[PDB]
């Protein structure tokens with residue numbers, strides 16, 4: 678069983694080292710806390726939270742970094758390297774990359790204003806990476822609600838509360854124009870915008886993301902508080918101001934009978950949201966871990982030990 682006290686004897690200052698690393702990086706990259714949370718999500722959804730995403734290419738397997746959901750998108754890898762080196766310096770050969778990334782995600786959420794909790798620990802590191810599985814398992818922003826639900830179920834998260842709460846990760850961070858062009862200009866081959874996008878916000882987004890513009894330009898997921906971890910994400914949805922199709926689907930899908938009341942409850946209460954977010958995060962962090970003597974304590978997060 679994973680346990681929050683796992684390093685209390687062997688590396689008691691691990692969360693502190695992780696915190697200071699993020700605090701320091703945030704001075705020059707305000708986006709890093711968002712990026713790190715996303716890294717952990719992408720770890721967990723592919724063979725579980727086993728740091729498989731941190732591995733670079735080898736001649737026998739391809740890196741997940743070249744997945745459709747990771748390439749030219751996922752970021753923060755050198756920051757993870759830095760906190761890893763610092764922990765190895767304090768606590769040699771003790772803390773797994775999988776656990777380190779889990780703590781990093783939690784600390785990132787707290788540093789951005791979100792809930793504070795101790796994550797379960799004891800995960801171990803994969804002996805390979807899973808590119809095809811990453812391409813199969815990471816959901817895409819054009820997914821319908823039933824597709825999103827299938828994608829969460831596929832990895833062991835059956836509950837609509839899992840989906841709606843973890844979606845609150847879009848309370849901060851950035852999204853490239855490429856992922857919303859259809860909503861803005863040609864939704865579902867209509868040549869018209871997505872009708873569930875508020876028309877005032879549509880104009881703003883078209884201004885940031887013109888047809889024939891730079892597809893890599895970044896826009897904030899949360900128009901209310903772009904860098905603060907809070908429940909404002911859900912208030913946006915109630916106003917038809919979710920950024921990506923999958924955001925707005927939680928509130929507007931014909932299949933949203935079960936998700937609408939979760940969105941509303943989380944918009945109405947910070948405490949309700951934060952409680953559900955911590956619960957869902959810990960469920961996601963419990964996806965198929967290696968434990969005990971399985972896998973490794975990887976010394977360099979990019980390569981399996983030899």
Ligand code: HEM
Pocket residue numbers: 708711712713714715718749750751752816817818819820825843844846847849850851852853856921923
């Ligand atoms: C449920 C369907 C999901 C879809 C379709 C989706 C899609 C996306 C997309 C397209 C981006 C922008 C990527 C880029 O522009 O490079 C992104 C960013 C982000 N996602 Fe999600 N996501 C989902 C779930 C989640 C979950 C469950 C979390 C966290 C628990 C998460 C956290 C993040 C964060 C924090 C960012 C901002 C990253 C940054 O600014 O570097 N996402 N997501």
Ligand SMILES: [Ca+2]
Pocket residue numbers: 719720721722723724725726727728729730
């Ligand atoms: Ca993984």
Ligand SMILES: [Ca+2]
Pocket residue numbers: 848849899901902903904905906907908909910
């Ligand atoms: Ca926010």
